[PDB]
Amino acid sequence: MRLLYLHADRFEYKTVKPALKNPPDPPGEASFGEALVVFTTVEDGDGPQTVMYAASDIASHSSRLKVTTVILYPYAHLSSRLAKPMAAHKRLIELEGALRTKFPGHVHRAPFGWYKSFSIACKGHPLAALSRSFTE
Amino acid sequence: MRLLYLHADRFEYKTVKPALKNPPDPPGEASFGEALVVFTTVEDGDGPQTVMYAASDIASHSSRLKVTTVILYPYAHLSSRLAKPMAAHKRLIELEGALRTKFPGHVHRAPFGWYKSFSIACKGHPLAALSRSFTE
Ligand SMILES: Nc1ncnc2c1ncn2[C@@H]1O[C@H](CO)[C@@H](NC(=O)[C@@H](N)CO)[C@H]1O
Ligand SMILES: Nc1ncnc2c1ncn2[C@@H]1O[C@H](CO)[C@@H](NC(=O)[C@@H](N)CO)[C@H]1O
């Protein structure tokens, strides 16, 4: 699993065209104020251990940043070792459930399997952009 | 070299704190309308061949997107095989010069070695976000 942690001032997205023949989540749109935006690329061989480590690390960083909102943003573009889309979906749903057991704030998982527009205003402090890898 | 191609409606950044003891470029800020934003992570072992391939590919994609502006945005966060910062700087300067020989539009290289805030509004079409790897 490869993650990009962006400490946003604001963030929004909207699904546009379906990126898979049958996107497993419905379309939609949302916007937020200050949040940790977690661009999330599920990688070949990710499993529940990987999910568990990633959730703990996201919760620990959110704590370090004093943020109350985490967006899990499916992203197909952070690595060249992608999990197939059905395994990918399965892992993101797991990641969402695992983070809730570790982080007391708002957890928002963006829909999986669509092309999406988004806007972000990302902070410039030394910890506002970091990337993480998790495996098992 | 790892690149993330974002087809933006708009993009801006400003340097904040220095990220290296002596950032080799001066601080600053800029904003743009429709541009291809190229988040660029220089990787261990990148050389002039890598630079040459990346410049050709960025020019070819910009053409495919009918964009007139390319932002080369140094980014330390797209891989776990980073080039040291002096080699990294050297490669980005090379990449900027190489792209100019391949693409007729505005080329803007953002400064290297600072933490930066940025805002982007990224398009949602099927080609608005893609990643590329180059080596030699
Ligand atoms: N291995 C993987 N990890 C994370 N997400 C993955 C994935 N495989 C497929 N997706 C999702 O399918 C859409 C098209 O690839 C993806 N959509 C996107 O990556 C959009 N932000 C592009 O606009 C994403 O929702
Ligand atoms: N291998 C590499 N490839 C691309 N850029 C690199 C690099 N090594 C160092 N940098 C630059 O130094 C700043 C701190 O790492 C980096 N700054 C950033 O990555 C900011 N966007 C964070 O706010 C970047 O300017």
Numbering used by the authors:
A (entry chain A), B (entry chain A): 1 to 136
Task: Please give sentences taken from the publication describing this entry.
We have been interested in a D-aminoacyl-tRNA deacylase (DTD) fold that is present across the domains of life in two different functional contexts: as an N-terminal editing domain (NTD) of archaeal ThrRS, which specifically removes non-cognate L-serine mischarged on tRNAThr, and as a freestanding ‘chiral proofreading' enzyme, which removes D-amino acids from tRNAs in bacteria and eukaryotes. Both share a striking structural and mechanistic similarity highlighting a common ancestry. Here we show, with the help of structural, biochemical and biophysical studies from three distant organisms, that the substrate specificity in this domain is determined by a differential remodelling of the catalytic centre at the RNA–protein interface rather than just the presence or absence of catalytic water as previously proposed. While demonstrating that the tRNA provides the catalytic group, we show that the side chains within the recognition site are dispensable for the proofreading function, suggesting a primordial mode of protein- or peptide scaffold-based enzymatic activity evolved alongside that of RNA.
To rule out any genus-related phenomenon and to test the universality of the observation, we chose to do biochemical experiments with NTD from Aeropyrum pernix (ApNTD), which belongs to a different phylum (Crenarchaeota), and shares ∼43% identity with PabNTD. Remarkably, the corresponding mutants Y115A, E129A and Y115A/E129A in ApNTD also retained completely the capability to discriminate between seryl and threonyl substrates. However, in ApNTD, it has only a water-mediated interaction with the corresponding Glu129, whereas in the case of MjNTD, this group is directly recognized by both Glu135 and His84. Structural studies were also carried out with the mutants of the amino-acid pocket in ApNTD. While E129A mutant also showed a loosening of interactions upon L-Thr3AA binding as observed in the case of wild type, no such loosening was observed in the case of Y115A, thus providing a rationale for rejecting the cognate substrate in the mutants.
